[PDB]
């Protein structure tokens, strides 16, 4: 088919933006630690997640 691949990797790029904003790394964040998470969410992240979703 090969068209939805691009169609949805645009959204995948947006979700890597979410990963990078929360951890500083696009795909290997290492955010979830065996005691919780490393850092708190930035002040404007939930709004952008809602807008995306």
């Amino acid at each position: 088919a090969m068209t939805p691949f691009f169609w949805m990797f645009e959204e995948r790029e947006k979700m890597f933006e979410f990963y990078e904003r929360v951890s500083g790394a696009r795909m290997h964040a290492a955010y979830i630690r065996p005691g919780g998470v490393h850092q708190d969410l930035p002040l404007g992240l939930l709004d952008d997640i809602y807008e995306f979703s």
Partner: protein, 71 residues
């Protein structure tokens, strides 16, 4: 002094998010589609009927001219 300030949802929550599948039906019956196909076929048949009869007459006229010129 300053109270805690961290990333939280706005009061009253976020607006509702759509998740149900949305595949609208454009709308045209199979009977209607078959009728349109048959109608366009019939119109083409009639037009080509008329044109081919005219072409037969034209060919006959050309043959008449050739017959006149032959001797």
């Amino acid at each position: 002094a300053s109270k805690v300030k961290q990333d939280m949802p706005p009061p009253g929550g976020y607006g509702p998010i759509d998740y149900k599948r949305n595949l609208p039906r454009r709308g045209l019956s199979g009977y209607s589609m078959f009728a349109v196909g048959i109608g366009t076929l019939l119109f083409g048949y009639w037009s080509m009927m008329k044109w081919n009869r005219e072409r037969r007459r034209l060919q006959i006229e050309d043959f008449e001219a050739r017959i006149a010129l032959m001797p």
